[PDB]
């Protein structure tokens, strides 16, 4: 671990001292020491790395994006400076990117991350990290290049494999992603044991018919990523009551269900009207959930925020729902019409979060053909009647009627969730 150019060995005694103050928690004192050792040796890398590290720690205790922001500069400044050992160079700059990501300036992170591949082109671990920078801003095709290059040279990088498998699954290369996900998981390299790759491998094997897919859901549970082999959401609050099927009473939203079940024809009529006259507002499902068929959706609220244009189109419905913040405010849920046509089979899948239940309201239900399965039980809609399930559980749908099928979906906060918890949780 090379951390002193020679000139930093010269002045080690003073450097040791400052860091002393910091490993004993006197982070204001420590920062100021390093500040004066840095004004006193403006070229000392370790002094500068000293200021930057205490600026980190201060920013953790102060829980302050600004303290942090100013340390990201100082980490940069260390690598701007001459005769910087390579260890301090990499660590300083890696620190910078991994923090920039924290604060969410990914554009920024990536540039530090590509600076870092230029500086060390023989580091597969740093390519790997850059590939991650690409995924976090959605740039899948560059992520795919990084990992293909890594794997060309270290073909067993456990970490490039789950990530490569992640990326091909995302492109619906379901057949090909499996061996990468599987191999990448068994590798045990550091980074493989994420529930994300567990979730996605078992899904891939399901969509190709592989019965082994539930041996891996038991596993991902038994490593502790999934609540259960049936319930594999990953954005959760540990605690919440977990059943696939609820009753209006069980949820304590008995009023919402009522304002829905008694005003169901209007809800329908407004969505039929949009179908007949504003069909553009209905949008194709774009999350790769369909084996086959047509399924479009007209969304009125998303992440607890209302869509004004959409609500010009079902306007009495948006007024009637504004009465209920348990759903209009679910920043982890949607409210939307969902029209599904014959020939349709929706792959088994899970939502992202346990933090929400999902109400369906029958609006136009054809008399045969429309199954939904959530775990062990199978159920059907009734017009003017509401169903409730925990979409964090595994659900699958078929539409094999002779005409279209329309329902209203209304997401509510998981009812055991307390007010401050609805204020805090990240929106999804």
């Amino acid at each position: 671990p090379k951390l002193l150019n020679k000139f930093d060995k010269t002045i080690k005694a003073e450097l040791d001292a400052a860091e002393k103050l910091r490993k004993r928690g006197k982070i204001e004192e420590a920062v100021n020491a390093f500040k004066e050792l840095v004004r006193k040796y403006p070229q000392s890398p370790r002094a500068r790395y000293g200021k930057a590290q205490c600026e980190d720690d201060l920013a953790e205790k102060r829980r302050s994006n600004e303290v942090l922001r100013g340390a990201i500069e100082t980490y940069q400044e260390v690598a701007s400076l001459p005769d910087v050992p390579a260890d301090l160079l990499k660590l300083s700059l890696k620190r910078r990117s991994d923090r920039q990501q924290f604060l969410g300036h990914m554009r920024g992170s990536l540039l530090t991350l590509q600076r870092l591949v230029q500086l060390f082109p023989n580091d597969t671990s740093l390519k790997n990290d850059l590939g991650v920078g690409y995924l976090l801003i959605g740039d899948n095709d560059n992520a795919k290049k990084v990992y293909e290059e890594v794997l060309s040279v270290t073909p067993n990088d456990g970490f490039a494999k789950v990530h490569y498998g992640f990326i091909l699954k995302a492109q619906n290369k379901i057949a090909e992603s499996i061996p990468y996900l599987k191999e990448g998981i068994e590798s045990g390299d550091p980074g493989t044991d994420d529930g994300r790759f567990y979730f996605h491998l078992g899904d891939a094997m399901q969509r190709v018919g592989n019965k082994e897919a539930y041996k891996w859901y038991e596993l991902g549970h038994k490593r502790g990523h999934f609540a259960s082999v049936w319930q594999r959401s990953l954005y959760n609050v540990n605690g919440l009551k977990a059943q696939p099927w609820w009753t209006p009473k069980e949820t304590g939203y008995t009023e919402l269900v009522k304002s829905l079940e008694r005003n169901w024809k209007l809800i329908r009529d407004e969505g039929l009207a949009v179908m007949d006259k504003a069909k553009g507002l209905f949008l194709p499902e774009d999350e790769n959930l369909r084996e086959k068929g047509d399924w479009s959706q007209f969304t009125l609220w998303q992440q607890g925020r209302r869509n004004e244009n959409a609500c010009k189109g079902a306007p009495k419905t948006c007024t009637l729902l504004e009465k209920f913040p348990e759903t209009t405010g679910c920043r982890r849920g949607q409210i939307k019409y969902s029209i599904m046509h014959p020939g349709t089979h929706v792959w088994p899948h899970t939502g992202p979060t346990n933090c929400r239940l999902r109400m369906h309201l029958g609006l136009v239900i054809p008399k045969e053909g429309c199954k939904i399965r959530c775990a062990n039980e199978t159920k059907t809609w009734e017009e003017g009647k509401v169903l409730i399930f925990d979409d964090s559980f595994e659900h699958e749908v078929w539409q094999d009627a002779s005409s279209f099928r329309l329902i209203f979906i209304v997401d509510v906060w998981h009812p055991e969730l307390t007010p401050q918890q609805r204020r805090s949780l990240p929106a999804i």
Partner: peptide
């Protein structure tokens, strides 16, 4: 991308600060 009915994005929440 958002994760609305599924979990196909690499991160579904975009944290950005404390």
């Amino acid at each position: 991308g958002k994760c609305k009915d599924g979990l196909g994005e690499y991160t579904c929440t975009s944290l950005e600060g404390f």
